[PDB]
Symmetry: C2
Subunit: 360 residues, 2 copies
């Protein structure tokens, strides 16, 4: 059967298992089960499933070149789908909690979960906690007998932790590090000295690349029992490179994509985020442009936001983006070539992952 | 060395390991490490450490009757301390997130973490996420070589999930189950039909007993490689019984203990919580008393809160509490007797746990 329909069918199976277990082992009543069903659907469904489907696609690649009984092929594909849903539910956790943390209004054209009338922040924080707990229930149930259970749980933990650390890097990126202090309300930077390429790269590496690219690629290897088919250092390098490019695209869209195509109103400027646009602008601006940026960035005032967007537009950041893109293309192709030494099949799966990202 | 000083020494070691790893593997800078150090201290230290020390005390009990090399005794005690800190950090996670969810003001006489000036909700939600992620880093690092790693991680996951489910039961306990609906803002019950002993017992079982009593007792058995010394069904029964009594005491104190001894201003009445006091009052009130309760419960108005406390005082709930306590004493002693069939030593550790709870 087609990959996406298998993946969606496994969602229904996993959902039924989780809710049936709540009834048989956690004393849940039907109305609370219905609440949790709706919560799961609303927070986990509706995206493109790129992360989860990467697990499936990696596993499919190895199936095409490896000898297996049919029942083993089916088991591997089912495991890849469950692992993919673990990643989708991990993302759902972070999106629920991040939307609360950031006071976000919409996501994908619909209200953020905490804003639903019968949810509220009091429930939504805990709903997000449940979403991540479900990833572990999935693993322990479906992968109980599997040789890769330990490695998969360990990997998942490290990626989850890296993501939380990256969230810290993101939410504090507009403050001066030397002034961080739980006792003192945090002012926005005035010098923007920490708006550098290396600091930006650290935010992005931790907040998105581990869970968006590294985890799906490695989970695909694990469910395929194929980690020996790769040089793991290369997998990490290519995941972090593609993931950075993905986030750069998101940063550009936050400012310039119309809200109707973006699914929300972008507020990176008002939030004073260390975005690719801000770092790149500061890397080419003259003194007068720097001063005008400082007088306007990080303010909710629409007039000041408009000034910042004007500065970005006049700064010809399309030039810098094309130069960045051309360099990423160079480096990603080089890493794919190196991956071919040990596994042409995995290299091809990464090439597919890159094509989908680049042409998004 | 004395048990508490070993436990506190292990805290410093674990903290140093976690922060050193953030520097060596997660690219953290010194100021963010300092923020996280302060966060860990503020959220994890200052309580009585009853949960973590239960792990240590259970392990000490088995050490007194089991033949081991000295280095093995030291390893077991170190493992018990690390496991105990996993439980304390799990609690710290739930307290950080619960205080945000509930809009709480103080905890232990100090501001809730999210209210610190340089924290804010935006950071504190993620700080709570980090606290629970640290429990897993502890386990994978310190217990990497241990035969009990799998069982301990599986147990911890189930208890974490049960606690989140219990949080859902608690936050929704003042609503009618048949009206739960993410799409519709939730009104408080008017009939109080779900304020029953069995529904109360479900809230308490999941929201506190698993992590407060079951997890420390079983973790103590696991680090001692002694789970075969017990009938696990009895361990569960006695943990859930003692844990319920613990929460009943907390419910009584929320209403009647002066805020200076309580560490916070109790708001269970204004919050319309399904507390032991409310359930027990409704189990003995006449029609006029029920009507007066309904007209006043779940309102912030101090006059209405005062009415509810008057109703509780005039209802002689001390009578019901002494009858409840006498029954718990009966049942806990019976379960301790049954535990002696397979392990007098573990039975004694449970007797100690009960004495500390009862005389609190
Ligand atoms: Zn955010
Ligand atoms: Zn963005
Ligand atoms: Zn609460
Ligand atoms: Zn309480």
């Amino acid at each position: 059967m087609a990959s996406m329909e298998r993946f969606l069918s496994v969602y229904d199976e996993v959902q039924a298992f989780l809710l049936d277990q709540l009834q048989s082992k956690y004393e849940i009543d039907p109305n609370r089960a219905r609440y949790l069903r709706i919560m799961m659907d609303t927070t986990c469904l509706g995206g493109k499933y790129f992360r989860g489907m990467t697990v499936v696609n990696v596993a499919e690649g190895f199936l095409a070149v490896t000898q297996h009984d049919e029942a083993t092929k089916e088991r591997i594909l089912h495991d890849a789908c469950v692992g993919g849903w673990m990643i989708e539910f991990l993302q759902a956790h972070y999106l629920v909690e991040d939307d609360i943390m950031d006071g976000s209004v919409m996501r994908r054209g619909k209200p953020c979960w905490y804003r639903f009338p019968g949810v509220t922040t009091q429930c939504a924080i805990n709903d997000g906690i449940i979403l991540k707990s479900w990833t572990q229930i999935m693993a322990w149930h479906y992968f109980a007998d599997r040789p890769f259970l330990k490695d998969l749980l360990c990997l998942f933990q490290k990626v989850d932790y890296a993501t939380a650390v990256g969230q810290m890097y993101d939410v504090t990126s507009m403050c001066d590090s030397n002034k961080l202090d739980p006792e003192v309300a945090q002012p926005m930077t005035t010098d923007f000295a920490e708006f550098t390429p290396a600091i930006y790269k650290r935010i992005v590496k931790y907040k998105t690349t581990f869970y968006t690219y590294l985890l799906p690629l490695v989970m695909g290897l694990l469910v395929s029992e194929a980690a020996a088919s790769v040089e793991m250092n290369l997998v990490e390098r290519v995941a972090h490179l593609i993931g950075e490019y993905f986030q750069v695209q998101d940063d550009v869209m936050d400012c310039f994509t119309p809200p109707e195509q973006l699914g929300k109103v972008g507020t990176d400027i008002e939030d004073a985020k260390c975005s690719w646009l801000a770092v790149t602008f500061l890397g080419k601006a003259n003194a007068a442009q720097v001063a005008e940026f400082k007088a306007n960035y990080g303010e909710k005032d629409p007039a000041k936001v408009a000034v910042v967007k004007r500065l970005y537009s006049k700064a010809n950041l399309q030039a810098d983006f094309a130069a960045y893109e051309a360099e990423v293309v160079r480096e990603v192709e080089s890493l794919i070539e190196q991956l071919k030494v040990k596994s042409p099949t995995f290299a091809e799966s990464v090439a597919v992952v890159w094509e989908k990202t680049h042409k998004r």
